[PDB]
Amino acid sequence: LVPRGSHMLFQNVSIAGLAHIDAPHTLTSKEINERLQPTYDRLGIKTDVLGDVAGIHARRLWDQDVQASDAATQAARKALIDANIGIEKIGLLINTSVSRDYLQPSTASIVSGNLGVSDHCMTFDVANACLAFINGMDIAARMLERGEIDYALVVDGETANLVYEKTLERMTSTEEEFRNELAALTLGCGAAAMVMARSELVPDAPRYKGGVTRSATEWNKLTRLLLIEGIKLAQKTFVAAKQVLGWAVEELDQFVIHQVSRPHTAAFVKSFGIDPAKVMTIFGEHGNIGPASVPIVLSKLKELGRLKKGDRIALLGIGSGLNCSMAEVVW
Amino acid sequence: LVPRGSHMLFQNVSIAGLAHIDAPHTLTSKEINERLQPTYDRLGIKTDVLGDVAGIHARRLWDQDVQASDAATQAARKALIDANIGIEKIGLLINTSVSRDYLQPSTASIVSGNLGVSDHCMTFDVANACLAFINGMDIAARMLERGEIDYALVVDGETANLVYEKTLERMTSTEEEFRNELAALTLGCGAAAMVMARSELVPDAPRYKGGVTRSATEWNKLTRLLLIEGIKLAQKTFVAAKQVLGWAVEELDQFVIHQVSRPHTAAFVKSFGIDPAKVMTIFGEHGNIGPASVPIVLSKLKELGRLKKGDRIALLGIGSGLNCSMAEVVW
Numbered sequence: 001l002v003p004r005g006s007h008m009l010f011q012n013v014s015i016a017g018l019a020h021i022d023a024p025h026t027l028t029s030k031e032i033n034e035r036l037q038p039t040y041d042r043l044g045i046k047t048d049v050l051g052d053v054a055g056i057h058a059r060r061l062w063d064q065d066v067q068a069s070d071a072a073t074q075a076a077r078k079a080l081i082d083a084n085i086g087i088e089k090i091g092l093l094i095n096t097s098v099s100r101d102y103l104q105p106s107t108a109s110i111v112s113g114n115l116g117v118s119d120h121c122m123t124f125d126v127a128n129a130c131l132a133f134i135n136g137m138d139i140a141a142r143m144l145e146r147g148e149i150d151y152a153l154v155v156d157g158e159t160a161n162l163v164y165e166k167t168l169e170r171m172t173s174t175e176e177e178f179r180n181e182l183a184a185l186t187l188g189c190g191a192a193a194m195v196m197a198r199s200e201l202v203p204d205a206p207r208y209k210g211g212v213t214r215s216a217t218e219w220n221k222l223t224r225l226l227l228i229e230g231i232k233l234a235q236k237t238f239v240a241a242k243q244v245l246g247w248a249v250e251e252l253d254q255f256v257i258h259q260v261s262r263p264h265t266a267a268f269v270k271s272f273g274i275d276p277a278k279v280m281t282i283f284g285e286h287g288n289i290g291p292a293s294v295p296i297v298l299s300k301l302k303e304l305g306r307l308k309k310g311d312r313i314a315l316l317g318i319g320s321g322l323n324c325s326m327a328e329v330v331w
Numbered sequence: 332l333v334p335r336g337s338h339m340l341f342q343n344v345s346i347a348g349l350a351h352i353d354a355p356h357t358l359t360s361k362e363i364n365e366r367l368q369p370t371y372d373r374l375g376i377k378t379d380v381l382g383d384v385a386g387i388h389a390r391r392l393w394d395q396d397v398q399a400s401d402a403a404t405q406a407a408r409k410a411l412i413d414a415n416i417g418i419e420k421i422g423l424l425i426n427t428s429v430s431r432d433y434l435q436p437s438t439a440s441i442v443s444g445n446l447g448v449s450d451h452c453m454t455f456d457v458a459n460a461c462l463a464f465i466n467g468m469d470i471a472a473r474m475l476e477r478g479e480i481d482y483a484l485v486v487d488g489e490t491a492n493l494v495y496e497k498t499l500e501r502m503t504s505t506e507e508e509f510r511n512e513l514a515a516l517t518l519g520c521g522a523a524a525m526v527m528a529r530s531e532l533v534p535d536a537p538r539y540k541g542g543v544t545r546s547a548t549e550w551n552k553l554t555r556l557l558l559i560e561g562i563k564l565a566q567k568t569f570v571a572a573k574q575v576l577g578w579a580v581e582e583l584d585q586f587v588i589h590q591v592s593r594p595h596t597a598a599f600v601k602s603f604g605i606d607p608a609k610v611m612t613i614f615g616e617h618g619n620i621g622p623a624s625v626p627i628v629l630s631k632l633k634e635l636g637r638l639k640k641g642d643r644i645a646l647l648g649i650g651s652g653l654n655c656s657m658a659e660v661v662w
């Protein structure tokens with residue numbers, strides 16, 4: 001009757017399964033630079049923006065014409081294995097990727113079709129730039145908490161190959177232009193999937209509590225001043241997280257953060273007093289995998305045995321909108 | 332403890348507000364045909380597919396370069412008026428349209444930004460071809476039912492102008508081709524928005540109970556045989572609706588159905604024994620407005636005073652996937 005933060009948290013939602021896919025082909029920022037060099041000379045720009053400003057040494061790409069749906073399918077088969085369950089158990093499949101096969105049908109239906117879901121399985125895509133995978137976990141969680149379903153898949157496959165091809169193309173023939181376009185060269189390919197479940201069905205599995213979102217949609221227009229607005233948004237979101245989840249920075253064991261660039265990350269972590277040792281980072285070798293970044297990093301943490309029962313894990317990012325979301329997993 | 336269908340239904344979710352926008356410019360199928368005529372002669376095809384096969388006499392288009400977000404904004408301002416509340420009350424805004432402004436940010440954030448939502452307002456797009464507006468109502472409903480929010484906006488703006496321009500272009504210079512492309516000429520422009528609320532906050536407002544989805548994602552590949560699969564999917568979905576909502580066709584007062592074509596509609600209604608007088612249809616003059624079709628038709632019913640307190644209203648469609656959803660409003 002009297003509201004409390006902890007009231008809105010999910011009580012019976014767990015992570016049964018989690019997997020990622022690393023895209024196979026490494027493209028180093030040096031090889032890209034050698035192709036851009038005549039153009040750096042052209043414009044008389046002496047700076048290695050990628051290596052030096054962004055902090056990206058390499059990214060991964062697909063070896064072939066891999067569609068988002070294919071990449072999400074692969075990650076999803078792995079996450080079912082990780083959960084030890086058959087596709088027949090899945091009552092919901094949400095696709096959260098920025099990369100998209102078609103106008104329609106949803107990417108989710110194509111992935112469902114590949115996996116062979118049953119006729120009871122509800123599917124749809126959620127789009128929300130780099131935060132969508134947290135949005136999709138939350139959406140699934142509400143259905144689980146209510147008993148509408150027992151198991152859900154959240155998936156995300158990202159592909160950047162056509163983006164890099166088109167972009168390098170345009171970065172060979174104006175500086176406003178050449179600058180606007182370098183930022184596509186921080187993106188990477190990859191995929192993640194997660195199987196979520198009612199907790200009684202998966203005793204001892206990691207627990208998803210939910211989280212908070214704040215927005216500054218006044219800034220939907222939109223990097224100097226965008227970092228600043230981002231930080232101010234995150235500040236507010238942290239206040240929300242304190243009010244709902246009871247967060248204090250020092251009581252969290254890991255921060256799984258969406259990454260835009262080494263300096264944006266550096267600024268975030270300084271701003272909030274976070275211990276950098278608690279922030280795993282794949283951006284320098286994998287680039288920014290959009291909304292798949294968070295679960296990939298979470299899956300990598302797991303596979304490295306870097307998580308312990310009881311660990312409080314913070315999932316967060318700042319996305320275009322502007323939006324910011326912060327959610328907690330208790331391993 | 333013993334499950335029953337009615338257990339999964341929403342108890343405290345209502346429709347506070349509802350509005351639509353008709354796009355202003357009428358393009359009749361005759362004017363289109365006169366431009367296509369040399370090409371009908373060319374291919375030696377004597378049939379008026381649009382007028383005679385599809386049953387479309389006209390559609391609406393925008394008069395200017397209206398983006399999906401602009402159209403959703405307009406409909407959303409109207410639906411707030413209809414609900415008699417300020418934007419500050421909105422805790423969630425979901426955009427469900429097929430038409431989309433950008434890769435990112437979400438269309439939802441752009442609409443939120445235009446309206447001036449508060450920093451507490453969560454936003455994201457849902458994509459699921461023609462059923463997404465029902466998906467977005469369901470998503471909002473779960474948050475409302477739990478108490479996470481008090482008011483939500485679901486919005487959808489559709490624009491087809493560039494589609495028609497590109498399509499007419501290609502339909503002037505091969506029959507497999509010319510045929511594949513005529514189906515874009517059944518689309519129309521328009522917009523809808525709905526304000527949903529916790530029932531205690533809006534005493535006497537129409538009640539959203541929720542609904543059911545079934546899928547046949549084996550057919551995500553995909554018209555002859557697509558109508559057949561559609562009907563078989565809907566049959567199953569009706570069985571689900573009977574098990575959850577207690578539906579029998581004769582106890583429903585209106586059917587608000589997504590429309591693809593006059594024959595697909597005719598086949599559906601015959602197949603299920605529905606009284607055609609209970610199926611309002613705007614397709615012949617407005618075309619298919621995608622996922623906005625359902626709420627537009629619902630808003631038109633309302634404005635015509637065609638609904639009475641206690642009326643059981645069935646919201647449904649068949650979408651690419653294949654998917655089918657069926658939900659109930661009790662006016």
Ligand SMILES: C/C=C/C/C=C/CCC(=O)[C@@H](O)CC(N)=O
Nearest residue numbers: 129130227230260264318319320
């Ligand atoms: C520390 C502040 C960061 C704000 C950056 C916002 C831009 C983010 C991006 O453009 C992508 O990486 C992610 C996204 N689109 O959501």
Ligand SMILES: C/C=C/C/C=C/CCC(=O)[C@@H](O)CC(N)=O
Nearest residue numbers: 460461558561591595649650651
């Ligand atoms: C009566 C059977 C109807 C099945 C038709 C499916 C195709 C539907 C469409 O392509 C659009 O109108 C709607 C959609 N994409 O969801």
Ligand SMILES: [Mn+2]
Nearest residue numbers: 024025026063
């Ligand atoms: Mn290779």
Ligand SMILES: [Mn+2]
Nearest residue numbers: 355356357394
């Ligand atoms: Mn006009």
